[PDB]
Design a protein around this ligand. Structure first.
Ligand SMILES: [Cl-]
Ligand SMILES: [Cl-]
Ligand SMILES: [Mg+2]
Ligand SMILES: [Mg+2]
Lengths: 8, 235, 235, 8
């Protein structure tokens, strides 16, 4: 799992 | 090259480019639109962000693939394959840095200084933090600390405005907190700060959901789930 | 711009670009490698094809999205939105045609004329048919018939060599027949010819599978399944 | 279903 950053 | 095209036509073509998944074209159209010198509406700001996030996202993913290959090639026992891996990683890195510098240049000339409403100012300051963060991801030299501090400073100003002027469920506020938390975890070597920010942001949003319509609730909870995803990964 | 880079370094970087899903870079590296003037090995031919098929594949998909929007905009009752959809479709079309012309130029100067073994000659002639077919997909003017005939002629020469010099299970032969069948169905308005070619190709391959190792059987049956997929769609 | 042509 890669950490989430905000959607484009 | 976009100077001869009407602003409205650039916006129209950015939307077509998005539908066609032509994000480099989309970003070029939106850069042209910004350079007309008028402020951007909410929809136009979102188009600008979609375009450049997709362009830099592809570059960052490619950079990570190449950086991993390069790191493996410098382990004990690895065969010398010459300069090519480093050279190509550097090529992609330089292109990525160029895109970041382009976005930062649009923000500095002159999107941020003209942005007075909280929704626009926070949006652009978050963008500034994000593109400095992408620069920090590849930085290794004597300015790394200053790049990191530039990201921190932009995020901090955006947080300060967002806390004063926006409700805790505002999607821009939530996405800013999400990304600043990632900055803390991954860039600033501050996992506890990252976890505290994600948790406080989530909890304060939860307590404000009751004020929202169904559509706003959907918008806010989608981003809250990203905060929860990170908390689950990190704890 | 690749003239100063060693051939082996271009090949190495094409493989890295493939791993990073940087297909425009991959194609530029392989164009540089071709322009060194030496023949390509089997692996190098495959790299060339992977690179350009991915580049043009993205352009073709984008072109189809834009062409559909344009067609809907010219239906009765549609609002006039100005020239922008046509202009942007034309921009993507021109870029696609440029990539096709680049590939066709590499084949003509001088890959095909130096290719004497069946596996190389058929591979390049199939490529020539493919890139003329992509030109035909967007052609609307007075040379459309000649573009179509150029695709047909290249495919036909490749078929003639492949039938004489390769077994019916050879993956290049199978992929050539698959694409020539698509040409017949979609470009030449000859669905019966497309179906007959796909069926005969499949059946003649089936009868030769017994001669193959396990690994060759896997290679051949994968492409046979694509022929079956088309037959199921078309009948 | 879109018809198949040969893999890249
Ligand atoms: Cl390079
Ligand atoms: Cl255009
Ligand atoms: Mg407010
Ligand atoms: Mg033979």
């Amino acid at each position: 799992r890669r950490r989430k950053s905000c959607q484009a | 090259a976009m100077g001869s095209m009407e602003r409205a036509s650039l916006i129209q073509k950015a939307k077509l480019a998005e539908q066609a998944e032509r994000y480099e074209d989309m970003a070029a159209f939106m850069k042209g639109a910004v350079e007309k010198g008028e402020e951007l509406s909410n929809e136009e700001r979102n188009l600008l962000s979609v375009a450049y996030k997709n362009v830099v996202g592809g570059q960052r993913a490619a950079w990570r693939v190449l950086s991993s290959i390069e790191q493996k090639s410098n382990e004990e026992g690895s065969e010398e394959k010459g300069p090519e891996v480093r050279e190509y990683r550097e090529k992609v890195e330089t292109e990525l840095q160029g895109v970041c510098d382009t976005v930062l240049g649009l923000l500095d000339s002159h999107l941020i200084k003209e942005a007075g409403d909280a929704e626009s100012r926070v949006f652009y300051l978050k963008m500034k933090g994000d593109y400095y963060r992408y620069l920090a991801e590849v930085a290794t030299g004597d300015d790394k600390k200053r790049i990191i501090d530039s990201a921190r400073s932009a995020y901090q100003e955006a947080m300060d405005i967002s806390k004063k002027e926006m409700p805790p469920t505002n999607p821009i506020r939530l996405g800013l907190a999400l990304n600043f938390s990632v900055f803390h975890y991954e860039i600033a070597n501050s996992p506890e700060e990252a976890i505290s920010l994600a948790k406080t942001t989530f909890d304060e949003a939860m307590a404000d959901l009751h004020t929202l319509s169904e559509d706003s609730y959907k918008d806010s909870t989608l981003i809250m789930q990203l905060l929860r995803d990170n908390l689950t990964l990190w704890t």
